[PDB]
């Protein structure tokens, strides 16, 4: 889970809908050695069931509520930076230019 | 002498919480899920795990 | 020819550990779960299968 906003986020409790679009395209979910340019050989995937996990730290209910009622503010608020932190521009170069 | 004043609890809460989908689909090239993860009033989730 | 799979882990040269802390962390030599008001008061026999 590598998206920079939700990568190292600190999540004060509620009920949060969390959608995801996986990819079933066998070409860029696998990887060949020799440049076996797939999707014509017969490779495929199939997903049985995809489950989430999480890991709550057990904080005391008086000291979690001095985190939560102190983190809920306008000045105590998370802010992450992308590492590569850039914008690709993707210019094509035709054959021998 | 690692301390005991209000770090880890007595109040009987879980440690890992697997969630289970709605939005189960299929596509010739795609797949989707969504998870109503509920956490609740306390027990702040760290979102990197 | 069709096949199933087999999985197995290898943990040589080290021992498994289970810390005696209620969050299981290595916060110190003493723990919060080791010097609380329940395990330092009374004697406790353990069964361990």
């Amino acid at each position: 889970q590598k998206f920079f906003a939700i990568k190292n986020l600190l999540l004060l409790p509620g009920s949060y809908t969390y959608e995801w679009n996986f990819r079933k395209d066998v070409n860029m979910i696998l990887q060949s050695s020799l440049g076996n340019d797939l999707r014509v050989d017969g490779a495929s995937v199939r997903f049985d069931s995809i489950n989430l996990y999480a890991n709550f730290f057990p904080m005391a209910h008086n000291t979690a509520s001095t985190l939560e009622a102190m983190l809920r503010n306008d000045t105590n608020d998370q802010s992450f930076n992308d590492y590569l932190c850039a914008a690709n521009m993707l210019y094509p170069i035709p054959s021998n230019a | 002498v690692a301390p005991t004043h209000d770090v880890t609890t007595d109040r009987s809460q879980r440690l890992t919480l697997r969630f289970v989908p709605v939005d189960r689909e299929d596509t010739a090239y795609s797949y989707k899920v969504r998870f109503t993860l509920a956490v609740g009033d306390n027990r702040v989730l760290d979102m990197a795990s | 020819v069709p096949s199933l799979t087999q999985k197995k882990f290898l943990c040589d040269r080290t021992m498994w550990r289970i810390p005696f802390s209620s969050n299981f962390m290595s916060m110190g030599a003493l723990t919060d779960l080791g010097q609380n008001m329940l395990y330092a008061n009374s004697a406790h026999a353990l069964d361990m299968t």
Binding site: T63, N81, Y83, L84, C85, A86 | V1, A2, P3, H5, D6, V7 | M27, G28
Partner: peptide, 29 residues
């Protein structure tokens, strides 16, 4: 003070350095 949260090495609590509060990890920084 929040001294009842830090894992104390003895009587003095283990209070970290001042670079342990933010980060500046950009590509070439």
């Amino acid at each position: 003070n929040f001294a009842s949260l830090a894992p104390r090495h003895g009587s003095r609590p283990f209070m970290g350095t001042w670079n342990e509060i933010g980060t500046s990890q950009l590509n070439g920084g």
